[PDB]
Design a protein around this nucleic acid. Structure first.
Ligand SMILES: [Ca+2]
Ligand SMILES: [Ca+2]
Ligand SMILES: [Ca+2]
Ligand SMILES: [Ca+2]
Lengths: 480, 480
DNA sequence: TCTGGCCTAGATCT
DNA sequence: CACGGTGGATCGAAAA
DNA sequence: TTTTCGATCCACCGTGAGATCTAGGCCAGA
DNA sequence: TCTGGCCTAGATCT
DNA sequence: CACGGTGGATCGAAAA
DNA sequence: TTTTCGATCCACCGTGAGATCTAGGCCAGA
């Protein structure tokens, strides 16, 4: 009978990102201020945590890894979803279907601990698998949808491991997860049996190369084609599609960074205009024109292209992407590239990120007309894997993965969770053991995406909408 | 007339490390819980901040740097100190004297912003100057002392700059600061004129090499001697001391890390036992015995020596230092080094870190007997600069800097503030400009060490005491 | 019969 | 021995 | 009899992050 | 009159 | 258009 | 008349970080 609810207390706890001691200090000092009641003790909020946590039968924490069985998280998370429905019984008493997306990531530059010398690699680099429910329908009848399908707040962990990314472990855990998905059953809740269909789409093309039968990463995994032969419409329109590889849905993240890098590469090569920078002087010309365009781009648009000495081109990620697209005329003047074509890239990126249904005939029309205008303008550079996958293969996988609007299917949401992971591991863990820290990060991320608390917790929305482009809204199949 | 005081509200704000929006959300949700009063608005707490902030006449924030005049912070901070006295008038109505320590640091691996291309270096590496009051006395009559002279909570900023460490800027800002110290006046407060004596001791020997007239860093800056000639007692006991170089007081931080590294170097060289690892096979012997001792040290003491690829030997910092010293018999057995000598190193490190007065005759006795036992045991390795400065020069600078108990004079406190700096710059800044972020970090660190709030704010003390060593407490001049 | 010049390569502390 | 911290397991003791 | 609630301890964690003289080789060398 | 072998150096995406 | 955020300047309007 | 207090917007920031096939040279070459 205190002022706050224990569910509201746990939601505020994780919304403010407070610690246990921090909470006892706040509560004891507020009682010291003289209001006899103000909060539940941490005992009550850990009892509320005990409502969020999956059964011990399916959790597995170790010194060096942890996992959970898939079905157990589906049953738990959909149980938590039934209370989010305004009345889980006043819905029609029929089977429902959860369409979910899942995937995984390797992230590096992790803090190294001084404990538990345990043989495997130490703690060099994190690798985690994760899942998120997008949509519940009974024949298209949306009973629940994520209000923010792109927020990290809804990504739920399936496993994590302190191992660097490698095609070996990548294929092993992929095929094992696929088997576990085939070995899953519709969940049950108080007389409701709900099917679950999963899409392994929350994955970068950079791992899809391992999940595809292409030795190169520069070969389009949907084409199985070389960059030289990539520049033709007909031969790739006359190529078959590999087995279920549309499950590798459109990775909206890398497409934009690859667009930025390929357009900068072209801006460098406007001197000699050959795909490869191999040749005579073209290296010195590249060095010169790259430095010149970095300085004339910085002085007018106030950005610095980031530096890496272990090796990597840049981190343009999100902000350089959107800033580069905010007024494309700016880079069109500085680099001297056509503004129409970057407006087409804006149109398609906006259509992909909108999060709504897209008419595939108009999309395929604009994509092939963009391929036309590209090759007639800049042929000599072989377009990257992702921009070819966009122009030729995109409409096909859009029509395949049309059961959910694209942009809700994304990895940007899940890989942003690594931001939480590090901050979870540093603040909210108990550091007396690696196994303890692994239990901490497990339960902390399960609370971080407890759907009911994720519904009733603090958030900020003032970023509601922004100016869509005219050819985009022509392309946009927007209804409401 | 709300429940919390605005000073208590600001102290809780910065104790919990909350944001402005986080505070409005907490307060509005707590009013939404129905207790009509609970906190002052952020308006009240920014008015309380306006009490902490130094006058605009002496602050200087820029796009790329910021500073404050020294006298202005002394006058402000001692003004804040007068309220910490139980009754600033019931003290004897006489002049007081603040003995303070100060210094600076360069720290790297800083987050790079995408804004304000401003010419100088970008934001590659931070360099900040800082000060802290230790002690107020009127002829030894302690009227105030820091209860925790080693906590970062009392370090106060004097300037900061986005420039990498370099002997040039180091000497320029050193000499300028020294001039500004000579150009300072005793503060005034409501009929009390208080003198201020500063010690530039919060600095590593690694910068003291620039502040000393020694081209080498491996040459002892107090000796001005070579490592070969460093191994003699008499010739260095017969060497004069440079001008005021005792102001470069005992850097307790690097002494312990250098002890760890030099003892590991000796553990490697137990095969051939020559100072330099130059020679025939000694390289292969070093590689082998280093790997072997890393593995036999890890498997029993559960530690991993950290890796650096830009270049650096290790980061043993604090935890590897104290863990290595907790049961020295462990490393004595694994490396095969004498336990007595590492017990002597423990005794002297414990005496330095105790924070209390030390009898210099007994200290000089034990230090020269440690030099004897070292050279008779391990002569062939030339002891490092810092361990020589300890054994020969330490008692001299202890008797010089005896006006304050050593260990309160330290840099570990100030350089831990870089932990706050990064976390201050990422969370609590406003990111609309570099100049805005520099104002944020300025005022945030001034609040982080507002002495009155630093007194009345949450903290944790259960780490009160631990087992001193017997020869130490023999050496320890401990009274109370 | 053994000090100096050149350097110099490769150890040295963050 | 720098020190301000890290959540869970447990004691125990007092409410309930 | 069970719940709750504070205290307690556990085994560490983050903050210390580009240039250098000098030990020695060698080479002559009368 | 123009495909293959060797490689190979130097572009390629994080 | 990812989204959860960043303190100050200002409006305004309601206490005081 | 001044203070206070919520809302608001500003111009962005952190989270995406070691191995590769293939384009082309060349070299012969009957
Ligand atoms: Ca990643
Ligand atoms: Ca990746
Ligand atoms: Ca530093
Ligand atoms: Ca240093």
């Amino acid at each position: 009978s205190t002022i706050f609810s224990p569910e509201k207390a746990l939601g505020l706890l994780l919304s403010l990102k407070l610690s246990k001691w921090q909470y006892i200090t706040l509560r004891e000092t507020t009682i010291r201020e003289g209001s006899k009641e103000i909060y539940p003790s941490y005992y009550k909020v850990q009892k509320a945590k005990l409502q969020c946590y999956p059964p011990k039968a399916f959790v597995a924490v170790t010194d060096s890894s942890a996992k959970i069985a898939l079905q157990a998280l589906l049953d738990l998370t959909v149980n938590r979803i039934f209370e989010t429905i305004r009345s889980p019984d006043a819905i029609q008493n029929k089977q429902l279907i959860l369409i979910s997306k899942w995937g995984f990531d390797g992230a590096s530059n992790q803090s190294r601990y001084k404990q538990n010398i345990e043989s495997g690699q130490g703690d060099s680099s994190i690798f985690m698998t994760s899942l998120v429910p997008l949509k519940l329908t009974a024949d298209g009848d949306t009973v629940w949808v994520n209000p923010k399908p792109c927020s990290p707040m809804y990504c739920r962990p399936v496993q994590f491991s302190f191992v660097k990314e490698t095609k070996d472990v990548v294929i092993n855990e992929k095929t094992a997860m696929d088997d576990e998905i085939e070995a899953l059953v519709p969940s049950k809740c108080q007389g409701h049996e709900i099917s679950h269909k999963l899409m392994m789409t929350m994955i970068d093309g950079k791992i899809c190369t391992y999940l595809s039968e292409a030795k190169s990463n520069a070969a389009c995994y949907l084409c199985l084609a070389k960059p030289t032969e990539m520049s033709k419409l007909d031969v790739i329109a006359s190529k078959t599609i590999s087995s279920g590889v549309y499950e590798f849905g459109l990775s909206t993240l890398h497409a934009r960074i690859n667009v930025m890098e390929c357009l900068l590469h072209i801006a460098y090569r406007l001197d000699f205009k050959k795909w490869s920078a191999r040749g005579e002087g073209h290296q010195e010309l590249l060095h010169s024109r790259k430095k010149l365009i970095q300085d004339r781009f910085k002085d007018d648009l106030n950005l610095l292209i980031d530096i890496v000495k272990q090796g990597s081109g840049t981190t343009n990620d999100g902000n350089t992407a959107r800033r580069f697209f905010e007024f494309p005329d700016k880079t069109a003047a500085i680099t001297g590239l056509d503004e129409d074509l970057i407006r087409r890239f804006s149109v398609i990126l906006q259509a992909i990120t909108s999060g709504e249904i897209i008419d595939v005939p108009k999309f395929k029309e604009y994509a092939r007309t963009t391929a036309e205008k590209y090759v007639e303008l800049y042929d000599w550079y072989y377009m990257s894997s992702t921009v070819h996958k966009l122009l030729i293969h995109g409409g096909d996988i859009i029509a395949e993965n049309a059961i959910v609007p694209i942009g809700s299917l994304s990895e940007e949401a899940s890989e942003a969770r690594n931001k939480d992971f590090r901050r979870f591991r540093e603040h909210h863990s108990r550091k007396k053991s690696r196994q303890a820290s692994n239990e901490d990060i497990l339960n902390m991320l399960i609370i971080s995406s407890d759907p009911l608390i994720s519904f009733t917790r603090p958030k900020l929305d003032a970023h509601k909408r922004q100016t869509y482009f005219k050819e985009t809204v022509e392309l946009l199949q927007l209804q409401d």
